[PDB]
């Protein structure tokens with residue numbers, strides 16, 4: 001029940017291949033996972049952590065006190081989207097979506113909840129809400145209910161893309177609760193993201209197969225004008241995994257050229273709109289950077305070869321990737337949920353560690369791998 005407290009045991013072990021220290025935060029007998037890597041889950045001091053677990057028979061949100069090893073239940077009941085959740089800039093509250101209908105704001109102190117927005121009967125919420133740096137406005141996208149189709153299989157994926165569904169990129173005001181359509185279109189839109197310290201810019205993209213798609217690297221101003229593509233897109237080049245670097249210095253992404261058998265990370269200037277290569281990309285699924293983009297972490301995955309179960313800590317400046325420790329996750333889909341099993345590596349607020357999920361000990365749990373100065 002909302003408000004309850006649970007005392008956890010932190011067990012630290014040494015990785016057999018890198019000697020790097022790794023500590024498990026959650027029990028090995030109950031399902032737990034971290035939120036999406038681009039969403040804030042750590043307080044600046046690095047003492048509080050937001051995460052999800054089934055302690056109360058339901059996938060709910062908890063706030064873990066790293067120095068007390070005690071976690072308090074933030075939300076109760078069923079219907080929580082345990083991935084999109086995030087902590088406010090003032091760290092006095094976190095936001096999450098319940099029943100895919102109501103955007104909630106929760107006081108981390110009183111645990112009081114406030115529904116700040118409720119999707120209209122005409123639309124369907126899609127993607128994850130992303131707050132602006134000041135945490136006064138939220139951006140997101142929605143799909144016209146009539147145009148909505150359940151994406152069951154890949155056959156249904158491409159199918160939906162061609163149905164050219166009408167989607168809109170909206171902006172909601174935390175204070176007023178009023179929505180403002182900043183961009184609409186009869187195309188499948190997605191992944192809306194406010195430019196870190198610049199409410200002016202809002203990056204979004206076109207969903208669908210990376211092949212039969214014009215381009216996904218899109219940008220548009222808050223007012224709704226200057227809709228443009230981040231990169232010109234070279235014939236044969238596919239871009240993905242885009243994400244704003246925390247400080248807002250640039251839009252980092254990964255591109256792959258057919259016939260080059262090599263993936264390379266790229267940084268795009270939000271203002272100059274000029275892209276530039278940064279370094280190679282080891283075989284990884286997700287990619288997240290440091291605050292300034294000087295460090296990056298990656299998810300080793302599957303390509304007589306061999307599946308890569310390692311986490312990578314890339315050094316932007318030195319342009320060098322290095323194996324940190326091992327996550328050894330079974331990318332299995334639990335109860336239709338394909339994301340709980342994803343490591344979703346993210347740096348700790350001061351870069352001394354990397355938080356990630358894994359089910360190698362049997363069930364999905366949360367770990368924090370230390371990150372030595374040599375970036376081992």
Ligand SMILES: [Mn+2]
Nearest residue numbers: 286339342344
């Ligand atoms: Mn993922």
